[PDB]
Ligand binder design. Structure first.
Ligand SMILES: [Mg+2]
Lengths: 271, 287
């Protein structure tokens, strides 16, 4: 209730370490409605919001020259899973000499409070606020005319493939695809509209952007925030120009834009 | 409701600054019952607990060689006053290269949030727990037979000079005075017993120990209140709640004036075992 943020509850910083802590019950919407293979698993897109708001607050009152946050070189390790007992997640920030901020998202195993498990790591950059780029909504939709499928068709396999998305994570409206890209109409589930205000990178919309692509998120090269993900009405997914099939891991680009095509959130070098 | 401590509610630390924040409404017992010249004033001794608990928390889990806190060279500047508008008070901690921790207690006036008021600053030292010294209460009593003052005498006199202590700050039971010292019988007011557990340096007990210096000033014409101005050293051997007595004597500086007095103050339980010691405590007339 008195949380600083639904994903960043409490500031637990010491003289040695800048740190934020959150205790998650199974009931949070981004857990109860994000069940993979039967377990409540923290979604990859929640780590980004966790990281952003930690940086936003850990950096003090800021000048226009530092009043914007960008994330770089994100990594994903073991996921956070919730059972009958709550799970405490720690968000650690470490300032580097070049003015960038390294962040580690970790926890202390109930198996061993002296052992440690890292779930994600990355870097953040403070820059001047960025003017939003623009996308071509009319033509891009026109380049995605082959084998369109309903959200339900997207949704049916998702449930069948082992990903049981609850109502809070049913943000895709429809998929328009060509062999080169996928453009997804997006919507905010009505359940989470009451709390969409308290997110910049909203897990429902951000995950819907990731859902439109789909083995699992493994890394992200860069994340740019021009406006709230809530403003988004469309999202475009494309391969990064690496052209490597490899095994089951791929490098992809994902962008969010509003009704006019103005990009508000863009993700580069996904993996 | 979710305070870390009644005097240190929230950790608001940034990368640049280790910081804790508290918002006081004035309904807190240590404000509602601590009225100076008609205004609710945070008691000077409350800053001491503020610093201690901030340091204790800002210092991590700690080895025993560092599992004890001492405060040094405390100064008091403008008071914290609450009159209908809540005040947000910040505890800033800076680690010094010598391993000491500097603390600043400050706030930003609501009327111009870009301005700054520093209320108190000092230094904290992390060191090994000290075996608690002891007082000989029998011997001390034998030297405080010159005059004596009752509970009502003290708090009626306090009200007359401008210090309207409510029940939470009525910890003096009786004052025994001899030449150059005062022995004060103390008790934790019944009003605050429910939350005495969450204080090491309890404002009620600590303020009562400083109140005991009234013993030196009874009989002073148009006596004016003297408030905390500086403290050279504070030693914490155990919680003040255990305290049953307080000894007040002048520090061996021989610099006593109506404007300012410097005192040595010890608090001990019924056996004479000291729990808190304050050396070089200077108080100054209010004006
Ligand atoms: Mg102004």
């Amino acid at each position: 209730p008195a949380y600083l943020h639904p994903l960043l509850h409490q500031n637990t910083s010491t003289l040695s370490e800048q740190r934020y802590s959150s205790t998650f019950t199974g009931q949070e919407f981004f857990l109860r409605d994000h069940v993979v293979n039967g377990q409540k698993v923290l979604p990859g897109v929640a780590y980004l919001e966790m990281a952003r708001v930690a940086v936003d607050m850990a950096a003090g009152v800021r000048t226009d020259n530092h009043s914007a946050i960008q994330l770089k070189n994100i990594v994903w390790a073991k996921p956070v899973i919730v059972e009958d007992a709550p799970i405490q997640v720690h968000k650690g920030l470490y300032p580097e000499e070049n003015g960038e901020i390294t962040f580690e998202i970790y926890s202390h195993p109930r198996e061993a409070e002296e052992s440690l498990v890292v779930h994600s790591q990355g870097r953040a950059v403070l820059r001047s606020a960025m003017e939003a780029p623009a996308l071509d909504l009319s033509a891009i939709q026109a380049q995605c005319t082959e084998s369109s499928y309903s959200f339900s068709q997207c949704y049916e396999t998702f449930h069948r493939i082992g990903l049981a998305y609850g109502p809070s994570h049913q943000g895709i409206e429809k998929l328009f695809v060509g062999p080169d890209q996928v453009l997804a109409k997006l919507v905010l589930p009505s359940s989470v509209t009451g709390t969409a205000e308290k997110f910049v990178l909203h897990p429902s919309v951000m995950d819907a952007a990731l859902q439109a692509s789909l083995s699992l998120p493994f890394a992200l090269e860069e994340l740019n925030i021009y406006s709230a993900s809530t403003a988004a009405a469309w999202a475009l997914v494309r391969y990064s120009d690496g052209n490597a099939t490899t095994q089951k891991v791929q490098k992809l680009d994902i962008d969010l834009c509003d009704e006019q095509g103005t990009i508000c959130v863009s993700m580069k070098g996904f993996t």
